[PDB]
Amino acid sequence: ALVKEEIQAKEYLENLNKELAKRTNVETEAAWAYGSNITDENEKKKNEISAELAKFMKEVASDTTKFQWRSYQSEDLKRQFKALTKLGYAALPEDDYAELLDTLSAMESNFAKVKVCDYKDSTKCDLALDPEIEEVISKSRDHEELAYYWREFYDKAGTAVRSQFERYVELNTKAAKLNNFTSGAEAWLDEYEDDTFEQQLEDIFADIRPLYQQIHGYVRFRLRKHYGDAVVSETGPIPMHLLGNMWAQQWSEIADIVSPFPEKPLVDVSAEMEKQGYTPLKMFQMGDDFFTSMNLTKLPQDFWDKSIIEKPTDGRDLVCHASAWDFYLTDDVRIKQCTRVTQDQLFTVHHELGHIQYFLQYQHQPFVYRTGANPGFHEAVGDVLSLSVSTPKHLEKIGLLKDYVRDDEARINQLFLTALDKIVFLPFAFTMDKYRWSLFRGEVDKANWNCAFWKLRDEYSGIEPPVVRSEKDFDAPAKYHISADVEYLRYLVSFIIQFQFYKSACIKAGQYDPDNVELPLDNCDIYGSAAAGAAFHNMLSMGASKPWPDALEAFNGERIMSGKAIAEYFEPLRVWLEAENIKNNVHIGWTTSNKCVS
């Protein structure tokens, strides 16, 4: 009978969760070893342990059918059993699962090993993306130099992996269907537990898109003054290599060229960090201080002992894209980051530390619940603090910003600088998954896969490649998360909800009042705020024990993902920008790109 079975099921879950945490520990150590040190031997070891855990999860999913779990009284036990039925890739036949794993590692190791020749010295052929190629893209204003690096990089990180990528789409689809999702798109969307999730994101994106078009128009206008009309046209998509980032996903590296008031301060503290003798270790201690300042949890010793916080000196291959790692024990959490002493890197340290914090906050939950309320909550945590750290308020406290006068013009420069990261990214992130979803769904023929990518980047972001591409190229895997099979919607969701969290944390801190000119949202510093830290503790400590609207509610009492907060933060910029574009007769919008030949 059911009453007795439900008591037995509770003990069954308590043991199984512990066993899964322990088996996942072993798989995570192998994945960490390989990401830290890419070799044939560590590849084998990573993929072999994974295959062994996949076999066990098949057994678990089969054993869940012995329990009448859908008939139980406890919503909590039913939620745990539902989590165990979800096998993902482990639903695949043994041989197909091993093949998918060898595919994933071939792509991610391809990405991690790309090197290109110096533009000025064809003899020097060891420039990696991080840091050598990113340094040119962020700093050079030689448009031909920029196009050279763009093309070398995309050809090596994108095109070289087309056949592996094709086989990955096939096996990802096969797995999704063994789980009875229509495709990998639906499997990814299942993490949000909301069957109107895509529509909700279309609606929010539609509300913020007019602001994006204004920033896009003003930036193109400023780039025409800098490079001239032979390089940038008034009416076409912006050539992406001029935007200071290899994927044009954030434009803040060109702020010194597009800032609304060039004779007024523009915050860039990298040179003061270097002058003060900052190191990667100090930036991480800094991040640690900020979370502890809010009454949140200090980094444990294993973090300091076992983290990799600067790029190795030896000549060994590895993955430099930054990552944060839960080993599913107690306090065994770590970061691997190729720390560089720059303003943007100070934000990236706090982003990674936000994941680590959420690990420490939920580590007492059963293993199935030790993950974010939805993937976007995991990405938002550290960005709430980064939003605070980026303020002239904070940066003056830590001595990194000197002789700053925050008048109306400086305020516009700062809001615009923030927008070049936070608003510009929204169409970018949406397209990373609209592209992969349309491949997963079978909506694009293989003959049209490259131009389908560039057509989305054009339609949504109004950017295009520096040179003509065709179906002979394959550019999408040139983005880390596409080669590494990491879902990207979590970041679009994060960039919307991180404003809901920031606004609420600022109000709780006494740092934001919409009716007080002295407390504007865009200069709020939540450093030292126990009240903001309490709201974080209340939410993060839940892990995935409840549907995410319950976790949002634990933070601020709301249950709805909403673009109200991000619009409120940027509303002074919107008013100023619309007027400035009219004042300057700035053309808005763009004609269809000519850069991808079908």
Ligand SMILES: *[C@@H]1O[C@H](CO)[C@@H](O[C@@H]2O[C@H](CO)[C@@H](O[C@@H]3O[C@H](CO[C@H]4O[C@H](CO)[C@@H](O)[C@H](O)[C@@H]4O)[C@@H](O)[C@H](O[C@H]4O[C@H](CO[C@@H]5O[C@H](CO)[C@@H](O)[C@H](O)[C@@H]5O)[C@@H](O)[C@H](O)[C@@H]4O)[C@@H]3O)[C@H](O)[C@H]2NC(C)=O)[C@H](O)[C@H]1NC(C)=O
């Ligand atoms: C994705 O969707 C798939 C369907 O598209 C689904 O696959 C189905 O899963 C069913 C298992 O739930 C499975 O059902 C069994 O069918 C057996 C015989 O089927 C054969 O002939 C089929 C068609 O006629 C062929 O296509 C198959 O390949 C088969 O070879 C039945 O013998 C079997 O029965 C037993 O179990 C039922 C269920 O019992 C439940 O639990 C308790 C037990 O305590 C019951 O009292 C309770 O009420 C509940 O019924 C018993 O009632 C019965 O007495 C037997 O013990 C069962 O019906 C089905 O065959 C299978 N395929 C298809 C095409 O239908 C996948 O599981 C889905 N995947 C995921 C991950 O969700």
Ligand SMILES: CC(=O)N[C@@H](CC(=O)O)C(=O)N[C@@H](Cc1ccccc1)P(=O)(O)C[C@@H](C)C(=O)N[C@@H](C)C(N)=O
């Ligand atoms: C082991 C793991 O999945 N860790 C996650 C954090 C988590 O979800 O628990 C993580 O490191 N996630 C990192 C990306 C990554 C994802 C998957 C594997 C390897 C790396 P990140 O989000 O912290 C990296 C960060 C610099 C990032 O990618 N930001 C976006 C906006 C970008 N495109 O740069």
Ligand SMILES: *[C@@H]1O[C@H](CO)[C@@H](O)[C@H](O)[C@H]1NC(C)=O
């Ligand atoms: C990298 O892995 C190899 C074997 O794959 C191992 O011998 C070596 O010690 C590792 N290198 C470093 C620097 O850890």
Ligand SMILES: *[C@@H]1O[C@H](CO)[C@@H](O)[C@H](O)[C@H]1NC(C)=O
């Ligand atoms: C610090 O956090 C704990 C809970 O982790 C709480 O009990 C304590 O009262 C908090 N401190 C302050 C100053 O609110």
Ligand SMILES: [Zn+2]
């Ligand atoms: Zn992240």
